[PDB]
A and B are shown apart, each in its own frame.
Chain A
Amino acid sequence: YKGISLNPIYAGSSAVATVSENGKILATPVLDEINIIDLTPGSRKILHKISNEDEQEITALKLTPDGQYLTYVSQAQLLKIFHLKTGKVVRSMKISSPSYILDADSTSTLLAVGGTDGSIIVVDIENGYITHSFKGHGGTISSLKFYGQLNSKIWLLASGDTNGMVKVWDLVKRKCLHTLQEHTSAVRGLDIIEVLNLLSGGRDDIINLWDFNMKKKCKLLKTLPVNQQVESCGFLKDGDGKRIIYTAGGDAIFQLIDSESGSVLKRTNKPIEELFIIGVLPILSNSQMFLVLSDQTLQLINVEDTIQVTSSIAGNHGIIADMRYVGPELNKLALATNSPSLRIIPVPLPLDVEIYEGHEDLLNSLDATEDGLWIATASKDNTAIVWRYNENSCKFDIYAKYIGHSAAVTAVGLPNIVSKGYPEFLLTASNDLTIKKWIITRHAHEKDINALSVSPNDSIFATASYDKTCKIWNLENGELEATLANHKRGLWDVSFCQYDKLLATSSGDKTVKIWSLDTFSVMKTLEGHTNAVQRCSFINKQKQLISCGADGLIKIWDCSSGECLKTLDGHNNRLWALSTMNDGDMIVSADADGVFQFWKDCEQEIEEEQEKAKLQVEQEQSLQNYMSKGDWTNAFLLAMTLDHPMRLFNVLKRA
């Protein structure tokens, strides 16, 4: 089978990705690697991943405003500076202190690192030698800031202490110019603005402004409060007169406020997501911003009381509960993750995500229509919201909503929708036995209900659970038809065979049972797995039934056979989300990891087998006719290609 793997981009380590001044570039830390991606409109690709050591994780990394170097500190107290052109590390040297803040100048010659011990260093970039070391304050640094003019002879250095003090140094004098104690918390945001004036964001409430001179002339220009914990801050020239102040603060709120007045001028949005904006990557020339967010996401922003976001990209789809196919074109993918938003990805490189937040808790379960436009997302919140998507311009409508029962709706199922697209009913299942069926209500499973299954003819419904029993009933009523009543240790998954008209049960142990809908009996039993199948799926061909597996693998058998046909082992740890496109019969699998794989059979292997056998036949007959006629050159060529030593030696004898 062909298999296409997609990997998590911004995963694992909590180190902010860096870009250059151009937007066609980015570099993310996964748990041990820094994967660098060229970010073009459309042609977003990957250059290369760097694989220094899987033991240590990258503490921090920095990419200069030109795509020329990557300077990164791993877990060990040492920096590695990396040439981007050659794709090779330039230098590496230790620092004896875990660094956390890396500030490069706009010019690509000078960089500074600062960590926890209090001492920081400024180092040259083109030659990795420390220009000078500042002992700094007696506190863990939280932010750095430069003042880079291209043609001048003075550069500045502001430190953000964990204490409420900024130490502005000289660099051509290597002298602490001023020490301004104003905050009560760590200075997370820093900014140096041209005349001098100064800005400093302390995480408690504060955005300080300082009138400043190289001499002793420094006082408080102003101080600004924000209704959040400020994570980063700075200036923007839009509004040349009222030089606006941008503030990326904890509740994922990126405000634009005035310098002259304390009033806000422009907020972005109030996210239902309770996600910390882990920073902003400004451009300040393209009026573009990259709001990097603790759900490993980035927000393209254009700047001129809400901000219309320019774009949204993900860098991770970490833990995925379920995969679904969206669109009559079947190109979008519904991602039921452990996040309170259905994630839409496209089927193909960094793929932008489309997040739909309908509830505040994670998507417990998912179902969708074969004909596209209707979705049903059930949360760990007690809601089960049924959605219109429209195959035109990407609208998401959550007009349909079920308050349901008073428990976590662990499952939602739909057999068929009317041609009006008017949802008739949904079957909602919970962690407890508050299972019901809600139009646009039974009690069977003592243990937790594990799975649903829809009969495609809108006839019957079968449900697996942990108490080794599945229930089959009529869809229109709540009257129970029958019970599959037995297994060893539980049941994980059920699936209806429509062209075969059967039932499949991934059990709680390492096996699967096939049930005839006629006899209500064990039609077949399938073994061969190790720990937990958790997903028994029907192939589009309705012969090669698939089982995923929590050991991290895939194993497939013909339904009529009972012997496992093939086995794929792409994922590492587990395997949770499993789906299949039918028109192109493509198996799609997602583990607990952020890695993913497409799969598809091809009979071209059989075609090529026929062709190579044909070619063997033809050249064999050519060799035999040569053994008749002569042309011992061509005969010997054929004998070498055929590895026929007797005939070859005969050719040599004749020659």
Chain B
Amino acid sequence: TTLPGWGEWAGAGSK
């Protein structure tokens, strides 16, 4: 249930 989004910047460039 690891969610990119709420945690940090979820994008095509980096994380």
In-complex A–B contact (CB below 8 Å): no
Interface residues of A (CB under 8 A from B): none
